[PDB]
Amino acid sequence: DRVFVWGFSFSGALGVPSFVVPSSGPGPRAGARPRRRIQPVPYRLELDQKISSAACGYGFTLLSSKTADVTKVWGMGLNKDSQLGFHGGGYEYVLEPSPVSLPLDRPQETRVLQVSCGRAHSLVLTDREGVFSMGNNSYGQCGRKVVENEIYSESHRVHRMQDFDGQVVQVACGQDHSLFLTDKGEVYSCGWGADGQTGLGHYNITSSPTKLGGDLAGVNVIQVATYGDCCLAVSADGGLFGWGNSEYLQLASVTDSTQVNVPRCLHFSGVGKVRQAACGGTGCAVLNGEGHVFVWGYGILGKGPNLVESAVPEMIPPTLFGLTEFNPEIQVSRIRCGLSHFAALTNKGELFVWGKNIRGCLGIGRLEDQYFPWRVTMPGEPVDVACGVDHMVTLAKS
Amino acid sequence: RADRVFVWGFSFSGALGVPSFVVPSSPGPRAGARPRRRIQPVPYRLELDQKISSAACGYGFTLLSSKTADVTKVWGMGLNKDSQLGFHYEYVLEPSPVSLPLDRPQETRVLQVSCGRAHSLVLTDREGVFSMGNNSYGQCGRKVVENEIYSESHRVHRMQDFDGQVVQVACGQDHSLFLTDKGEVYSCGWGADGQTGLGHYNITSSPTKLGGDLAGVNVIQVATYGDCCLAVSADGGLFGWGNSEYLQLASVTDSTQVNVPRCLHFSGVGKVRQAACGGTGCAVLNGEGHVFVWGYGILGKGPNLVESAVPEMIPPTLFGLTEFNPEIQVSRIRCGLSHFAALTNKGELFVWGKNIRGCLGIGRLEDQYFPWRVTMPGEPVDVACGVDHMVTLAKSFI
User: Fold this and answer.
1) Torsions phi, psi for A100 (to 5 deg)
2) Candidates A252, A307, A326; nearest CB to B27
3) B281 and B227 in contact (C-beta within 8 Å)?
4) Is the Cα torsion angle B211, B212, B216, B218 positive or negative in sign?
5) Chain B contacts in chain A segment 286-345 (CB below 8 A)
6) Could you say which of A253, A306, A372 has the minimum Cβ distance to residue B322?
7) How crowded is residue B11: how many other Cβ atoms within 10 Å of its Cβ?
8) Of A65, A142, B32, B172, which has the fewest beta carbons less than 10 angstroms from its beta carbon?
9) Closest Cα of chain B to A381: distance in Å?
10) Torsion region of B286: left, alpha or beta (phi above 0 gives left; psi -120 to 50 gives alpha)
11) What 3-state class would DSSP assign to B341?
């Protein structure tokens, strides 16, 4: 029903053109006023589309609808690598949600299910035509061969990927790599490999979606999570797996290596069965079967100023998400990660955020970091959120 | 960060201090009354406007004390058939002011409370130690009176003639230990197992200084709760006396009733910094913050370790600890009669052992063969352990 945006505005990633020029709200006698580079509180994006999926890249945004109409994806923000596809004019920054073209075989039948965005590339998942990629391909993260002198600005190139065993049901962009999850419970990857983030047993560039093995072999993966150079995966029976960057204790419980290129099972007694995972630049979060959130890695993890790093998941007190004797049914039903901040939706329809407050990306008015979960207020019930580096998008109901 | 007091375990003798725990009670205004059980299986917040700095769990009763200069300094609840809560009903259902016959009630401060099977000790800063409750074995530090009636008695004995100021008191089952600032230990009470450590097996009705291997030793801590006793010296030495039916002192003697303090040298343990002693089990904390357990029972290393004469280290992983932050460690160990508790630098409480009437406070009522984290709506600072209940002194998260 409703789309809310907030955070860093000056790259156009929030989609309101008046955010970057002197302007005023309605009020016939009100003069224009200067804007800052931040929208510090949730703002309702005016877009007459039914958005079912949102993604925040590093300074840009994708929004997608499940409609059978030919226009299914909109984008705004930084576009110097064509991460939003091609857009007329020589505009490096798209200031309002603009239609993103897709070379579909049947544009009036195929539907878009999900969007994802990394540092400079994007992925678009369709129900019947595979995965589409656009943006920077300097590291093969778009799933096609690296062309060494390719110019990525003002590019019409959109790659199509269908060489998967089964339908792809989730796509997830890392910083300079991409993850693909099939309905057979198997993970594919491509892109930069220096930290092992592709999980293919080596450290080189991968320019075609390649199935991961290691501890994921024969495992029914139901979710993958990434955004920086670290990756997590959740299995159907509650198992947790990780690979990629481990400079920040993300995978230190199983290895001394800071660059893990083979997926490793992560056994944490006391967590129970993991149902969701989220992964930021230096931190990680999981949600277990009791609706409890656990955080680890490095940063402002959510248990006050004294918890800065850990190799093992640390439980966030459920009372910080509103649990009391008068509200004993409260638990978290969805977790998401930005690059350095965290987000949790409770079964009461309440959004909590914490972590680094990078240019008002927490959306709580005040600009300081939040070392404990903090409720975000907006004229609607949050259903899901996408978290960027310095901005956020919320999909909400009226 | 206000102070919080959490209680759990067996509630039907009143030891938890919530009168609604023993009668049908109820959420909202439309919630009907529900039957109570005899157990409170998860931590519950005891509402108290006073600041509790010391808590003690007797066998079915509780003492809480404040350092305030105000005249009311101690509160008690639970079993009181021997006046172990002082004069006040055989069971006190809510925290009730404990009467002390202090010379200067507006200046003297209470520093510590301790409770045994049916007696209590109250340590003040400048008026000595006060005792109350049963004295059938001289455990209150006064002569046994043959046919004394201990119920509904205003008797509170004062002990004010030690060599130095007393800095710690510890109640055993039917004996009492006192530790002075000269590093010396006094004892009184039942002596059949040698728990008073005075070189004989007879009743001792007046606090008497211990010798043996403690002569010339600077003791900084004593530990007891059943019929076995342990002491810790300033340089990391460990000493023990009393009951040794369950291998507690079997490394130095085949006697099961040791009435002289014996040095306990364990090369695998470092310098001992803390000791805790239950009915049949023992635990120590060394200079690296590592926990070792021995004796008999559900010691904490799985179902296969049930008895040992030598301390076995509990793997730090079971406390959520890693070697990448060796400054994060166990900071406090405590023993109940049949269970164990440990607090870490991360502000978390771990319990294990026999789960007697929900005294572990982990919801489920089964025994715990490994350390298990206790969830509570606050950060634990210290705990007291009884036979079948527990008290935690905590702080609010915010």
Assistant:
1) -100, 120
2) A326
3) no
4) negative
5) 304, 306-307, 309-312, 314-315, 317-320, 323, 325-326, 328
6) A253
7) 27
8) B32
9) 24
10) beta
11) strand
Q: Indicate the SS3 state at residue B20.
A: helix
Q: Record the tokens describing residue B302, joined without a space.
A: 């799985």
Which residues from chain B sit within 8 angstroms of residue A317, using beta carbons?
375, 377, 397
Q: What angle do CA A305, A309, A313 make, to 5 degrees?
A: 105
Is B234:B279 a contact under the CB 8 Å cutoff?
A: no
- Residue B397: phi and psi, rounded to 5, are -70, -35
Range(s) of the domain holding residue B323? 1-398
Dihedral, CA of residue A173, residue A383, residue A130 and residue A388, to nearest 10: -20
Which residues lie across from A170 on neighbouring strands?
A: A181
Closest Cα partner for A200 from A259, A274, A124, A286?
Answer: A259
Both structure tokens of B135: 């004295």
What is the total count of domains within chain A? 1
